[PDB]
Design a protein around this ligand. Structure first.
Ligand SMILES: CC[C@H]1[C@@H](O)[C@@H]2[C@H](CC[C@]3(C)[C@@H]([C@H](C)CCNC(=O)NS(=O)(=O)c4ccccc4)CC[C@@H]23)[C@@]2(C)CC[C@@H](O)[C@H](F)[C@@H]12
Ligand SMILES: CC[C@H]1[C@@H](O)[C@@H]2[C@H](CC[C@]3(C)[C@@H]([C@H](C)CCNC(=O)NS(=O)(=O)c4ccccc4)CC[C@@H]23)[C@@]2(C)CC[C@@H](O)[C@H](F)[C@@H]12
Lengths: 13, 229, 224, 10
């Protein structure tokens, strides 16, 4: 599903 | 022969590439911590995790990338996460044999529960790209080219990605023709080692369905990005 | 079917004299220390080699009855054995600890990767047998005292020297693994396998070299 | 080989 760890990882500033 | 807007691309990427080294913390472990599979497996995973962060920070910095569909970036990094790792592993093995670490790195991979059948090719491969004797500059782009490989699985818009790749491919195009005029096959033999790398994807992912130590488990980021089990 | 006291005493002779012979920690420190240069690797190894040979010779000289051998046959035995003798200490060391760097030093010491890989694959295989430090002692004593070396004037005399050491082994394979019977020949065949790897060892020494150094005095006594 | 001038002793 939504692999969020990576979403966050790049979404972070 | 390298337009000035290319020498701007190149300069940046080397800033992009080196800015993120990895902790001296998890490095005094390589050259000191003791030697069991229990121990070694933990070091490597922890590094692997560490380097996905280095790999995303870089990916983040790459030209344009940021604009691409948010739900694509994820698709591009869930792809190269492995393959780019193999490019790193080369930079530290066939290249760069210092006196500090690196051989004590190979040491721990030898006793990591990783199966010899899986290893002795992967290293005989590190010999192969060794024989090219590549540039830090040469690895630098490669890695970017791979982050930006137009048709990873399940991409929204390829042209958008191709777009971003081309300026990098055409530098390293010239860079090869310039810094190595002797045999022009080279550039294609570089691009070929990329293809030679997407074949190492399957072999890797199969190995995961077997790597196991004293009831240890993989870091959660790792599992996510190597689609483990 | 346990062992006798006589056999039990040779055994504890062999160990005590096998294990007594240590290698000098000055180097044992060096392996877990010195720089990782192609060159420094090779120096660190020829040390290990030469230092080992000395230990060998010591070990042979303790062996019961060796005393009693035509000196031209003492020589002949130690040159024949020594290589193979080292292959066993090697196989002992590389599947025991917290010093894997010996493997590491070798995988950057000027030896070809085509030579190196089989040797370890063989070393791993002999790991599988999983062998009591006892068994390595006896198997070494047997390789040493091996009558069929070239330039070995009076055999027989050697046969009769090696016979106790065998005999003791044949019991252990009963009195420790009566599961598979054809074990004794399991070992005695792995033995025979090692007597090949030294012709391959040979053809290496010719190739081998790093920043053109040179071999220690004793170790040159094999070949040129 | 030649004269392996090697004293066992010690
Ligand atoms: C070939 C087997 C071996 C090898 O690929 C391993 C790999 C895990 C990730 C590693 C460990 C890579 C690290 C994370 C590279 C990035 N870190 C880093 O660079 N720190 S560093 O810059 O401070 C440094 C520099 C120089 C020396 C020491 C440390 C290089 C070798 C890479 C595997 C174990 C499992 C997966 C399987 O696919 C692969 F086959 C395996
Ligand atoms: C396969 C490649 C590799 C390996 O066999 C090497 C061998 C040199 C002699 C070594 C170095 C042997 C030493 C002399 C054994 C005696 N030392 C010793 O016992 N130290 S120790 O007791 O302080 C100790 C204890 C525990 C761990 C570490 C050290 C073991 C590995 C042996 C070769 C480089 C060249 C020729 C080729 O035939 C052999 F194939 C090569």
């Amino acid at each position: 599903k939504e692999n969020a760890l990576l979403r966050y990882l790049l979404d972070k500033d | 022969e390298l337009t000035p807007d290319q020498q701007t691309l190149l300069h940046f990427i080397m800033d992009s590439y080196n800015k993120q080294r990895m902790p001296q913390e998890i490095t005094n472990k390589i050259l000191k911590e003791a030697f069991s599979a229990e121990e070694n497996f933990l070091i490597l995973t922890e590094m692997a995790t560490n380097h996905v962060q280095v790999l995303v920070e870089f990916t983040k910095k790459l030209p344009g990338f940021q604009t691409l569909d948010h739900e694509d970036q994820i698709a591009l990094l869930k792809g190269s996460a492995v393959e780019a790792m193999f490019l790193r592993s080369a930079e530290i093995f066939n290249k760069k044999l210092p006196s500090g670490h690196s051989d004590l790195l190979e040491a721990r991979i030898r006793n990591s529960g990783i199966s010899d059948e899986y290893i002795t090719p992967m290293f005989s491969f590190y010999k192969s790209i060794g024989e090219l004797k590549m540039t830090q500059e040469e690895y630098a782009l490669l890695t970017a080219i791979v982050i930006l490989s137009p048709d990873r699985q399940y991409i929204k818009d390829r042209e958008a990605v191709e777009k971003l790749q081309e300026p990098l491919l055409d530098v390293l195009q010239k860079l090869c023709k310039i810094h190595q005029p002797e045999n022009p096959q080279h550039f294609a033999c570089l691009l070929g080692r990329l293809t030679e790398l997407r074949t190492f994807n399957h072999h890797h992912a199969e190995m995961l369905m077997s790597w196991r130590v004293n009831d240890h488990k993989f870091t959660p980021l790792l599992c996510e990005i190597w689609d483990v089990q």
